From a paper:
Tryptophan repressor (TrpR) was one of the earliest gene-regulatory proteins for which a high-resolution crystal structure was determined in complex with its DNA regulatory site. The TrpR dimer is formed from deeply intertwined monomers and is related to domain-swapped proteins, even though it does not meet a proposed definition predicated on the existence of a stably folded monomeric structure, which TrpR apparently does not have. Formation of the extended domain-swapped structure depends on the conversion of two interhelical turns in each subunit of native dimeric TrpR into helical segments, resulting in the formation of a continuous, nearly straight α-helix of 47 residues. TrpR crystals in the typical native dimeric form have previously been reported for a variant in which Val58 is replaced by isoleucine (Val58Ile), one of 19 TrpR mutants created by Arvidson et al. to explore the role of the identity of the residue at position 58, which forms part of the l-Trp-binding site.
In the course of this work, crystals were also obtained and a structure was solved for Val58Ile ds-TrpR with a 23-residue N-terminal extension including a His6 purification segment, a spacer segment and a protease-cleavage sequence. The uncleaved protein is expected to include the initiating fMet residue, as inferred from mass spectrometry of similar N-terminally extended proteins (unpublished observations). This Val58Ile TrpR protein with intact N-terminal extension is hereafter referred to as uncleaved. In the wild-type ds-TrpR structure previously deposited by Lawson et al. the first modeled residue is Ala2, although the protein contains fMet as the first N-terminal residue due to its incomplete removal in vivo from the overproduced protein. Connected but weak electron density that is unique to the uncleaved protein is detected in the solvent channels originating around Gly -2, consistent with the presence of the extension in the channel; this density is absent from the corresponding structure of cleaved ds-TrpR. The remainder of the uncleaved Val58Ile ds-TrpR protein structure is essentially identical to that of cleaved Val58Ile ds-TrpR, except for the additional two N-terminal residues. Indeed, the presence of the apparently disordered N-terminal extension does not reduce the resolution of the overall structure compared with the extension-free structure. The crystallizability of ds-TrpR with a flexible extension accessible in the solvent channels suggests the N-terminus as another locus for the attachment of groups that might orient guest proteins within the channels.
Numbering used by the authors:
A (entry chain AA), B (entry chain AA): 22 to 129
The structure:
């Protein structure tokens, strides 16, 4: 039995809600071009919904600075041990004349 | 006593929510220009909030066609009696030779 994936009612109401969302995105796009975006957003949204969107922008900003500041901390800490291992390896491969000279001038 | 119109806390939180709304409107404006509006709207809104905006566009459309269709009905009905009164006035001001001729050809 090849069962139908969805009903004809759900398929029609899915395309309807799809076209209604596209009409809104297109309506808001031309509003930004016709400089009517600010009054249109007041018609589409309540004052509380506008405050919610303004705070969500600050939420995703503080979430990005939270991930980025620790991403730079994970890279700065990881690169910190990289210069130490490079310093240890380059010190072993250094010639004897340079090594014994560094022990004399750096360690008095 | 010249009472202060609002508190310093309410004035600061009013400018904050004002700048957060402007940042959102500007963020969405550049998204439409950088062709990133569709993924940004999915980040800012839930699927239910997107369905709500898509239906509100159809609401304001059906509210406009409701007002417009009856506006045209109020104008078509008002202009209908205007042609009747013009027909009555123009018929009284018509000459006798035209009036008695219309009674002969239109009323057999």
């Amino acid at each position: 039995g090849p069962m139908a994936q969805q009903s004809p009612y759900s398929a029609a109401m899915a395309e309807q809600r799809h076209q209604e969302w596209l009409r809104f995105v297109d309506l808001l796009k031309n509003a930004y071009q016709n400089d009517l975006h600010l009054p249109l957003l007041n018609l589409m949204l309540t004052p509380d919904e506008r405050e919610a969107l303004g705070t969500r922008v600050r939420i995703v900003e503080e979430l990005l600075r939270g991930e980025m500041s620790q991403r730079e901390l994970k890279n700065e800490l990881g690169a910190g041990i990289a210069t130490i291992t490079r310093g240890s390896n380059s010190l072993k491969a250094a010639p004897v004349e340079l090594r014994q000279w560094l022990e004399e001038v750096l360690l008095k």
